[PDB]
């Protein structure tokens, strides 16, 4: 009686995370699906292929199903992931002999957003659950963008606080432009998608959800389903950091990661360097061989690295959500990728945002609209200030450490037995039965 579900993820560490987080509750109790994870390759980075592999060693009973689609070739100034997911969403058409020979025959499929013209057209009669990767918020942006015919006005969706120019991917008002293309062609099939599952929680982003479900956006989308807080996912390999943030005082490391796509020169890594100096806060910081300092000596020089290193930690590489977990952690200094939002939002780790891309500046809004935290809008314009004073405030100030907790109790109790998402994520697959 127990349902065989396929997840279809895509490419890149952001998109694939979240997608193995879902494989890996459904393969579980309550769920208790069988689970096939399909696996596009050939992969872009090791990155990605590394942490694909620890996956299935520390998931056996998750069946593998590699879906080779070619390498596009290279092309001067077009962004090797676009290119990418452009290859991936072409082929989305030919999923339809490689899911009917699964066994046993499957009674669903979460999928990534690229394989949604594939799926809806070939595979109708089949659940198609498109599963997005990002807020609520900006997945509603990308719903729309087949109606974007004003490049240099806000975008007023019905029902939902504008969007302004300045946080909308200029990419997105040239109807030609690679990322475009497979956008367009993807959202003008959610209409078919069985339904929107967003890796979010309801009292998280409440008018976003309210204003999708009722009608008021007056698109002809599907329900749209929060089935987060996603349980993350143990990892063997052992954090070296944790015997040193039990030495330190509760709630006084700010944690600082820009992500997997960081854009900052090294300049920009200096300024912060010489401003998080000066606020003499203790720190663990994902800067850029996991044991290599001389990169950071050459970049700090070695007077200012000493000084950085007395108070905390340069790495190239954490367990994130083990960080985020720990009662030393008091703040976390973030780009606003959604998986790190939806990780801290979990623990209630206030965050200060200093988003650097379209989507992000539309996710460090829904972090200061829930209380989560605080967004320094022209961070880039002055980097050492801007650290030096909202460090205190991020550390210090009682209201938004207690708002951020607060939204660290919804989320729990959202994936919760009987939380919102929990429920929503049950009835989705009950309804398989
Ligand atoms: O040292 C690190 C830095 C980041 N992450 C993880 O990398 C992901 C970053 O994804 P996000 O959406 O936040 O940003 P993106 O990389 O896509 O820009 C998160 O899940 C983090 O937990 C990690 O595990 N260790």
């Known amino acids: 009686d127990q349902p065989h579900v396929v997840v279809c ?13 879902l494989a890996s509750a459904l393969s579980s109790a309550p769920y208790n699906c069988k689970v096939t994870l399909l696996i596009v390759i050939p992969l872009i ?16 009973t998750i069946h593998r199903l590699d879906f080779h689609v ?4 290279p092309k001067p100034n077009v962004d090797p992931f676009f290119l990418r997911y452009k290859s991936i969403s072409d082929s989305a058409h ?3 002999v490689h899911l009917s020979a699964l066994s046993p025959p499957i009674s669903a499929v979460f999928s990534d957003f690229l394989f949604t013209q594939g799926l809806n057209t070939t595979l109708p009669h089949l659940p198609n659950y498109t599963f997005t990767t990002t807020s609520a918020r900006f997945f509603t942006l990308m719903s729309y963008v087949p109606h974007l015919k004003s490049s240099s006005s ?11 120019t300045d946080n909308i991917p200029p990419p997105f008002f040239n109807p030609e432009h690679i990322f475009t293309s497979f956008t367009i062609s993807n959202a003008k099939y959610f209409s078919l998608s069985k339904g929107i599952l967003v890796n979010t929680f309801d009292s998280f982003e409440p008018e976003t959800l309210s204003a999708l479900n009722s009608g008021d956006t007056l698109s002809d989308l599907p329900p749209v389903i929060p089935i987060g807080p996603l349980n993350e996912l143990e990892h063997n390999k052992q954090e070296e950091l944790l015997p040193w943030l039990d030495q330190q005082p509760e709630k006084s490391v700010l944690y600082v990661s820009f992500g997997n796509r960081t854009a900052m020169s090294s300049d920009q ?9 000066r606020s003499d806060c203790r720190f663990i910081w994902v800067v850029k061989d996991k044991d290599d300092k001389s990169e950071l000596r050459k970049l700090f020089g070695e007077e200012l690295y000493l000084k950085l290193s007395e108070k905390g930690k340069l790495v190239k590489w954490v367990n994130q959500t083990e960080i985020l977990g720990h009662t030393a952690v008091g703040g976390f200094l973030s780009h606003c990728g959604w998986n790190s939002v939806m990780e801290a939002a979990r623990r209630g780790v206030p965050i200060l945002a200093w988003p650097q891309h379209g989507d992000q500046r539309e996710n460090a809004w829904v972090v200061e609209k829930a209380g989560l935290g605080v967004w320094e809008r022209e961070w880039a314009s002055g980097i050492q ?7 205190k405030m991020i550390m210090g100030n009682n209201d938004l450490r207690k708002s951020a907790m607060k939204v660290g109790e919804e989320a729990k109790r959202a994936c919760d037995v009987g939380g919102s998402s929990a429920t929503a994520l049950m009835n989705i697959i009950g309804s398989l039965k």
């Not at 890594?269 to 998080?276: A, D, K, N, P």
């Open 154 to 164: 806000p975008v007023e969706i019905p029902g939902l606080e504008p969007f302004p």
């Open 385 to 391: 200030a801007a650290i030096v004073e909202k460090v």
């Open 269 to 277: 890594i200096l300024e912060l360097g010489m401003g998080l100096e």
């Open 94 to 96: 030919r999923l339809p």
């Open 9 to 21: 993820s895509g490419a890149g560490m952001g998109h694939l995370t979240p997608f193995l987080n």
């Open 70 to 73: 070619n390498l596009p070739a």
């Open 45 to 60: 980075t090791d990155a990605e292929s590394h942490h694909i592999s620890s996956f299935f060693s520390s998931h056996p």
